Amino acid sequence: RFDLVYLVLDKVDEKNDRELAKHLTNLYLEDVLPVEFLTMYISYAKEHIHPIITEAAKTELVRAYVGMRKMTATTRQLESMIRLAEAHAKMKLKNVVELEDVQEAVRLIRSAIKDKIDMNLVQTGKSVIQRKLQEDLSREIMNVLKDQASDSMSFNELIKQINEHSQDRVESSDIQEALSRLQQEDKVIVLGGVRRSV
Amino acid sequence: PSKMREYIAYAKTKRPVMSEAVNDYVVQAYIRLRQDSKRFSFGQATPRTLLGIIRLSQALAKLRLADMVDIDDVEEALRLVRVSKESLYQ
């Protein structure tokens, strides 16, 4: 729901850090619009200026959204372009949304997404390796069912066997999260722990 | 024990002001510590640590009752920063 996220993280490259130190010590070595003009300018722009959307700029808006979607984008991004172009027209005091603010909003949102949407803290590699570990746990449950009649097993020993036998080492929480997925699909039953396959 | 409390009051009374070439050396030393921050304790050099280095610099300017901050004073202050780095190691 945040319209813009800004990665402030950066690494030292000694280019302007000398300039930052010099002007930071220049307040010790020595003693653009004014802030009150900014305050009255925002106060005049927020209520006395009413931009409108033209029918022309919507075509560039929709082909820009088509370009974003086939690159990765949601409709919240498009409505962010709409309100960003409205805010730029509020700044320019023209009371009209032109072409230029639309491409400026597209550029700014594009730079935000530079930093299939992969939201919900989910990457597609984790989204497929969860099902891969579910299949590996099903194979291990089938091997345990071939080994013994009882399908109930301890969580730590079965998790260690699944981590050693299936693939490279992953988190122990991922296997039990896939087992909770299988609880939701009702393929496997849990007690507690005890994990009984069907 | 009676003698320190007036000497530190005088040290608070002078408030020295430092020169520009010493500030250039401070800029070079800050660049060197950012290069060391490129190089275990994660703790890197910040602009706030640069202000701290400045604070140590005029603290020793206050103690020697001096009007300029000396260059060897600055490098001994950055040596104390290296001592803090050695403390971060051990």
Name the DSSP letter for residue A166: T
Query: Contact, B61 vs B53, CB < 8 A?
Result: no
- A22–B23 C-beta distance less than 8 A: yes
The CA distance from B31 to the nearest CA of chain A, in Å, is 7
- B30–A17 C-beta distance less than 8 A: yes
Nearest residue in chain A measured CA to CA from B29: A18
Neighboring chain A residues of B30 at a CB cutoff of 8 Å: 17, 21
Approach to solving: cryo-EM
CA distance A180 to A121: 18
- B50–A14 C-beta distance less than 8 A: no
SS3 annotation, B24-38? HHHHHHHHHHHHHHH
Query: Contact, A123 vs A168, CB < 8 A?
Result: no
- B37–A21 C-beta distance less than 8 A: no
Nearest residue in chain A measured CA to CA from B16: A28
Chain center to CA of B75: 8
What is the stated resolution of the deposited model, in angstroms?
A: 3.7
DSSP A140-165: HHHHHHHH-S-----HHHHHHHHHHH
Residues of chain B whose beta carbon is less than 8 angstroms from a beta carbon of chain A are 17-18, 20, 23, 26-27, 30-31, 34-35, 37-38, 47, 50-51, 54
Per-residue tokens: A124: 């597609």
Query: Which residue among A12, A20, A22 places its CB closest to the CB of B38?
Result: A12
A104: exposed, middle or buried (C-beta count within 10 Å: 0-12, 13-18, 19+)? middle
Q: What b/e sequence results for A8-39 when a residue is b if at least 16 CB atoms lie within 10 Å of its CB, and e otherwise?
A: eeeeeeeeebeeebbeebeeeeeeeeeeeeee
Residue appearing with tokens 């002001």 = B17
Chain center to CA of A93: 34
Q: Residue A5: CB partners within 8 Å, gap ≥ 6?
A: A112, A115
- A16 φ, ψ (degrees, to nearest 5): -105, 0
